Amino acid sequence: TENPVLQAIRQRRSIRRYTDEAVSDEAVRLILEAGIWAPSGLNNQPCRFLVIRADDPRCDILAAHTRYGHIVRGAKVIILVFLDREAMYNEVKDHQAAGAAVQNMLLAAHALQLGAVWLGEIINQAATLLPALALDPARLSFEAAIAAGHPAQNGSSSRRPLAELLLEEPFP
């Protein structure tokens, strides 16, 4: 039996090039819903979200603040992920929570047959980007941007074998 959840986890790829087809509001809502249901340490739910569509002037602003402008410009929708500092309890664990949210969103995108890619280089420019977007970096920590669209490529990656990542070999 090939479990669809396990299959999705294994087959989800960073997709960085999209077709010209529209991404529906309903798809975006479903992806966002996946994000909000990720866990958080105290059920503090520190993540906040901002949707930026291709036709939005803010797409150019985002592109201007990352080396991956071509991906940003090719995407149909970009979901920006932040932590509300007033909802945080622990820096390390709230960043882990943001990762869990992003992962849920990437899996949901894949499950909807959309392609997406986690963009983290862009967060290096948070200090100039947030003000450019009229957002307050004193209140918000910028965690990630997810670029998405209908896929125009299959994606390709690799991982080292499980046995190398285990600190001790647990099987007989």
Ligand X SMILES: Cc1cc2nc3c(=O)[nH]c(=O)nc-3n(C[C@H](O)[C@H](O)[C@H](O)COP(=O)(O)O)c2cc1C
Binding site residues for FMN, as ranges? Answer: 12-14, 16, 41, 120-121, 157, 159
Residue 113 CA, distance from chain mean position: 16
List Cα–Cα distances, 73 to 16, 96, 112, 171, in angstroms: 11, 28, 21, 47
Minimal distance in Å, beta carbon 6 to ligand X?
A: 15
Residues contributing to the site for ligand X (CB under 6 A): 13-14, 16, 39-41, 43, 68, 93, 96-97, 117-121, 155, 157
Nearer to its own copies, 36 or 132 (CB): 36
Instruction: For the segment 54-93, give every residue that binds its own copies (CB under 8 A).
Output: 80, 82, 90, 92-93
Closest by CA position to 12, among listed 150, 101, 114 = 114
The CA distance from 95 to 88, in Å, is 9
Closest by CA position to 83, among listed 35, 27, 29 = 35
6: contact with its own copies by CB under 8 A = yes
Answer for which of 72, 75, 112, 114 binds its own copies (CB under 8 A) is 112
158: contact with its own copies by CB under 8 A = yes
Query: What residue 16 binds from ligand X, its own copies, none (CB within 5 to 8 A, per partner kind)?
Result: ligand X
Query: What residue 112 binds from its own copies, ligand X, none (CB within 5 to 8 A, per partner kind)?
Result: its own copies
For residue 137, give the amino acid letter.
Answer: P
Q: Which residue bears the tokens 């670029």?
A: 147
